[PDB]
């Protein structure tokens, strides 16, 4: 039932529960603390705001609101209870204010942090890393953030079932919804107050299936939320480390070397 847990180390991450790294690679996911000094706020905030219109709100908010009139970042769900906004790392340098490109960079540093110490433990050799994750392990991937808005007045799913498509996700959530596939069953994955939840996509499932302890991308969805109040709305927000839109990255044999290629295009199509 219960997910592992860990912290962030200078060298790694220190998991406080027993099944280690080991467990939490086969389920796809587990609980990061957040870090000493990590501030929230502005993606609470951000979550909060997103979908009003900059006249309505204060004014020291303004900068968070209106981002419906932006172009090609704001995205409405037409069969389920989710709005959104998902911003690359230019989008997020023309249109996020400071403290709220800070608190994504940091959460991408934490995401890059993850995926570092996963190739660490995995044997994968350090001088390949930057070739197989095509440059995502030094920040040089799409660093895609997302701000999610569930709208409870809404008669449907809260979020379509899915797979992250790219390496390592960092999500912050404060409500229960978040379900998770293992076996035939879907499975709850409960928030934990001072941590994050962490999980893997599609690429690192790819790079890793035929290694000893393969990564396994976690298929998970958001059941209904129950009606109530929009300020109380459940709300979550993510930085996902992803491939570049372009290139081959590579998979991972089981003497460490980078074997074949796999392409990002070829990769997306099958997707979706
Ligand atoms: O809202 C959640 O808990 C899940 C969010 C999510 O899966 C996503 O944004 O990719
Ligand atoms: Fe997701």
Redesign the pocket.
């Known amino acids: 039932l219960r997910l592992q847990k860990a912290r962030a180390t200078e060298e790694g991450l220190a998991f406080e529960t027993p099944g280690g790294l080991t467990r939490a690679l086969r389920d796809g996911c587990f609980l990061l603390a957040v870090p000493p000094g990590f501030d929230t706020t502005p993606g609470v905030t951000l979550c909060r705001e997103f979908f009003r219109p900059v006249e309505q709100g204060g004014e020291s908010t303004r900068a968070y609101r209106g981002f419906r009139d932006l172009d090609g970042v704001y995205f409405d769900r037409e069969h389920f209870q ?1 709005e ?1 906004v998902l911003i690359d790392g230019p989008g997020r340098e023309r249109h996020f204010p400071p403290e709220l490109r800070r608190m994504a960079e940091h959460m991408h540093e934490l995401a890059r942090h993850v995926l570092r110490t996963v190739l660490t433990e995995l044997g994968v050799a350090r001088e390949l890393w930057s070739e197989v994750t095509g440059g995502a392990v030094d920040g040089r991937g799409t660093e895609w953030f ?1 701000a ?1 808005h ?1 709208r409870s007045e809404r008669d449907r799913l ?2 379509a079932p ?1 797979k ?1 498509t790219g390496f390592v ?1 960092v ?1 912050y ?1 404060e409500e229960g ?2 379900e998770a596939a293992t076996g035939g069953s879907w499975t709850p ?1 409960d928030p934990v107050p001072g941590c994050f ?1 962490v999980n893997f996509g599609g690429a690192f499932e790819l790079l890793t299936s035929g290694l000893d302890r393969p990564v396994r991308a976690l298929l ?1 969805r ?1 059941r209904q939320c129950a009606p109530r109040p929009e300020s109380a709305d ?3 927000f ?1 930085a ?1 480390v992803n491939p570049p839109p372009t290139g081959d990255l590579y998979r991972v044999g089981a003497d460490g070397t980078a074997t074949v290629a796999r392409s990002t295009e070829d990769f997306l199509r099958d997707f979706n």
């Open positions: 989710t959104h997302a999610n569930y809260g979020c899915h992250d996700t999500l959530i919804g978040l994955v939840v998970h958001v459940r709300f979550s993510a996902f």
